[PDB]
Amino acid sequence: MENFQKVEKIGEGTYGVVYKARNKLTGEVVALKKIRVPSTAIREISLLKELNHPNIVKLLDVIHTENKLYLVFEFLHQDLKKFMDASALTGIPLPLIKSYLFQLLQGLAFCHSHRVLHRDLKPQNLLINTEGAIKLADFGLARAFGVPVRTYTHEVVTLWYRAPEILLGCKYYSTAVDIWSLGCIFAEMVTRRALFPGDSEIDQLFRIFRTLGTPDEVVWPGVTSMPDYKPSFPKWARQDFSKVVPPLDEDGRSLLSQMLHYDPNKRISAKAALAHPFFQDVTKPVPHLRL
């Protein structure tokens, strides 16, 4: 760690503090993360250093010293959460939403092809630069250190982007969980409001049900035998997407519906999503960032 000079506290992640830092040797400006000895974690994280892609925040270095783990990441200057908050008055223009979605799906398709999932996508871990790129941060960290209810600061970990199979207690969930989360973020970029802002697991589930309909054996074979499924769940009818994400056009609503399929086996893959007609006219606009 002596090789790094902390510039500033960026914030507090799930596992530890995140610092903006300078490498005293390379001159590099970086995101330095403190993770709150386990050899299985070392080995997992070392596999991540290999998983390199332009829409994945690069893991530069893993440093295990004194019973302590530090991850050194590529640094980006702004996150999607703050960008959305700053664009709240007129919205992010559709061509930019589409470009970001497209790039994030390329990110997922890559990781998923290597059997690596994120599990905790959220606006705060999607990072953007001045050139119009967006990148997924902290990929793979969840299978290394788990997802707690509270962070080390007791901050509440958000449920808003959590897939229904996780909430229903599936232990062996798939890459489809990341597609669900990205669908939720897509809807939020469009409407400028979170799609399912649950404040407990049941509230999260019940918000999902109220918009997409309570799932049953017709739309999701196997659903009623999931660990946390209860026959006593209220039965809500599904809303039309035209009501859920106006003014998203038919191509967008079509794609979003496939990202939000209940059955993870029906839910569109990242690769198939990249071929959806929504992306026919996709471009790469540059955002206006005040840094």
- Contacting residues toward ligand N69, per CB under 6 A: 10-11, 13, 18, 31, 57, 73-79, 124-125, 127, 137-138
Residue 85 annotated as lining a ligand binding site: no
**Residue 2 assigned ligand-binding role:** no
Indicate if 120 belongs to the active site: yes
Among 61, 120, 199, 251, which one carries the catalytic annotation? Answer: 120
Residue ranges in the chain assigned as alpha helix (H):
39-48, 80-86, 94-113, 141-145, 164-167, 176-191, 201-212, 241-244, 250-259, 270-274
Q: How far apart are the C-alpha atoms of 74 and 58, rounded to whole Å?
A: 5
Helical segments of 116-162, H only: 141-145
Q: How far is the CB of 221 from ligand N69 (least distance, A)?
A: 35
Residues in a beta bridge with 78:
128
Minimum distance from CB of 120 to ligand N69 (Å)? 9
Question: In the complex with ligand N69, which residue's Cβ is closer, 77 or 288?
Answer: 77
274 is in an annotated binding site: no
With respect to ligand N69, which residue has the nearer C-beta, 24 or 82?
82
Nearer to ligand N69, 79 or 188 (CB): 79
Among 237, 162, 165, 173, smallest CA distance to 197 is for 162
Q: What is the largest CA-CA distance in the chain?
A: 61
Least CB distance from residue 10 to ligand N69, whole Å? 5
Residue nearest to ligand N69 (CB): 31
Least spacing, CB of residue 36 vs ligand N69, in Å:
14
Nearer to ligand N69, 13 or 183 (CB): 13
Structure-token pair, residue 23: 């490498």
Q: Is 123 annotated as a binding residue?
A: yes
- Partner residues linked to 9 by β-bridges: 19
Nearer to ligand N69, 60 or 170 (CB): 60
Non-local CB neighbours of 194 within 8 Å, separated by 6+ positions: 160, 184, 188
Residue 18 annotated as part of some ligand binding site? yes
Please, what is the minimum distance in Å from the beta carbon of residue 283 to ligand N69? Answer: 24
Is 98 within 8 Å of 278 (Cβ atoms)?
yes
d(CA 134, CA 101): 9
List residues with catalytic annotation.
120
Binding site feature residues: 10-18, 33, 74-76, 79, 122-125, 138
Binding site feature residues for ATP: 10-18, 33, 74-76, 79, 122-125, 138
Binding site feature residues for Mg(2+): 125, 138
